[PDB]
Amino acid sequence: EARILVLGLDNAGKTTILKALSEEDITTITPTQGFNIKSLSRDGFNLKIWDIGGQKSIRPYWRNYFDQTDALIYVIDSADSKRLSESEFELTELLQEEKMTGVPLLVFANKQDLVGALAADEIASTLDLTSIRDRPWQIQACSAKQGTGLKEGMEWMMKQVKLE
Amino acid sequence: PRKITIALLGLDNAGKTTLLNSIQGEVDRDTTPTFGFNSTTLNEGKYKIEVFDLGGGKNIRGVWKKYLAEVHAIVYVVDAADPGRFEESKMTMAEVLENQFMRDKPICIFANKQDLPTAAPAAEVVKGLGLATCRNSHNVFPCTAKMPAGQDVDHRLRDGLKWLVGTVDREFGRLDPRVQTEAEEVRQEEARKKKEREERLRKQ
Ligand SMILES: Nc1nc2c(ncn2[C@@H]2O[C@H](COP(=O)(O)OP(=O)(O)NP(=O)(O)O)[C@@H](O)[C@H]2O)c(=O)[nH]1
Ligand SMILES: Nc1nc2c(ncn2[C@@H]2O[C@H](COP(=O)(O)OP(=O)(O)NP(=O)(O)O)[C@@H](O)[C@H]2O)c(=O)[nH]1
Ligand SMILES: [Mg+2]
Ligand SMILES: [Mg+2]
């Protein structure tokens, strides 16, 4: 069993990804409140995921679900200009968190299907990922809307999980 | 025991990650493309080597520059069996060597995938990368990073590491204080224009 944390700004596409990986319908999706459990079976592991809202009032409740986290998935709206810096601050706050120590980081650079969508390398810079030395991380460009990138993101994540 | 820092560079599909696994004896791992950062510590002789494994894909390779100030040397990997890309690799390698923080630092080139019928000799790689007019100390090691199942790793992997370490070593005196200094400089500017970026959405 792996405890996988999935975070990011509201509207980034967390739930849409989680549902896409779950082979479910994504045509009508609602902003998320409360803490909804998702169970993914992948590589003989059972992944225990909380689907959580990323609205500003919900974010302080993120801290309560950090324990024995095996991997952190972080979702970005790649095409949403003004909110990029806000996303950075929140991820920074996360990586400063003590129970995130040495925890593998997967960044889903989501909505690559939108015109204006940043590439992996500029996301990596605007989010200050290239300063990191204390954890392994992937940025995986993806489109939850179109089902691209997701399997590749998880493939890397599952490698890091099974290594431990 | 001295610590030195090394970067794995080279185009995607060259075999950087696989070579990193093999040189540690981790044989039965398979690999996915790299789009980020991954540190690994090796030991050779009296040196402790930290190895940044980075991606070389078009959409991530522009990140390399962010690390060069922290390194003593480069392991540059080439798919010797894909001469169709020698020119791209050449440009890419030239651009690295023309970076300010690359002066006087050695390069260990691996001509990887020598198992494949199309494997170019270590000789044609030399011409292909324009190493004669290069401005850094270098050496080329043919190798097979992916040996067949149940066989020993290629010994040429550690030979190349050994040469790179030996070369850094012979010059450790002026290079290391240079690296400690320059890495600190880059670190503090990246921090400060983050601070500006950070409390410029104080905005309320
Ligand atoms: N164009 C595009 N839109 C996407 C993609 N993934 C999700 N969206 C859309 O982005 C919006 C927000 O998605 P959602 O999954 O709710 O994001 P969230 O992170 O779960 N939000 P919250 O934190 O409030 O629950 C929806 O319109 C959703 O369909 C994508 O890959 N491309
Ligand atoms: N025949 C053969 N294939 C090899 C050899 N070394 C690596 N490969 C194959 O080449 C492919 C790329 O390997 P990989 O290590 O991921 O390359 P990379 O340079 O790390 N790529 P990236 O920059 O995207 O992370 C893999 O399919 C790997 O198995 C080799 O010596 N011989
Ligand atoms: Mg949600
Ligand atoms: Mg790699």
Side-chain angles (χ1 to χ4, degrees), chain A residues 4-8 13-19 24 29-39 48-54 58 62 65 75:
Chain A
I4 285 125
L5 201 62
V6 182
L7 299 182
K14 295 183 294 292
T15 308
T16 308
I17 293 181
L18 274 165
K19 270 177 160 298
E24 305 181 350
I29 283 199
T30 297
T32 287
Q33 318 108 307
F35 313 83
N36 309 271
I37 188 177
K38 304 286 181 179
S39 290
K48 207 199 187 213
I49 306 161
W50 289 114
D51 190 25
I52 314 178
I58 305 169
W62 285 0
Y65 296 82
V75 193

Side-chain angles (χ1 to χ4, degrees), chain A residues 85-86 88 92 119-121 125-126 128 130-133 135-139 155 159-160 163, chain B residues 21 29-30 32-39 52 59-60 63 66-67 70 190 194 197-198 201:
Chain A
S85 326
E86 181 194 8
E88 162 177 13
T92 297
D121 61 311
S125 301
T126 67
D128 190 41
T130 62
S131 284
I132 294 170
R133 300 293 182 272
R135 73 184 68 253
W137 58 267
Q138 275 282 93
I139 181 165
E155 182 167 7
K159 212 227 161 163
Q160 308 294 324
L163 247 75
Chain B
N21 295 331
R29 290 204 227 161
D30 210 339
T32 70
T34 305
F35 281 90
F37 166 87
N38 200 286
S39 183
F52 298 169
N59 288 321
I60 201 45
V63 159
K66 280 307 188 59
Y67 300 87
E70 318 200 333
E190 296 304 291
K194 147 156 200 185
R197 197 170 48 220
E198 148 167 6
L201 65 87

Side-chain angles (χ1 to χ4, degrees), chain A residues 3 11 17 21 28 48 52 56 68-69 88 96 107 112 114 128 130 141 153:
Chain A
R3 293 181 181 175
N11 204 64
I17 293 181
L21 295 166
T28 64
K48 207 199 187 213
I52 314 178
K56 199 158 200 318
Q68 279 318 71
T69 295
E88 162 177 13
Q96 284 177 355
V107 173
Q112 290 291 321
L114 297 185
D128 190 41
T130 62

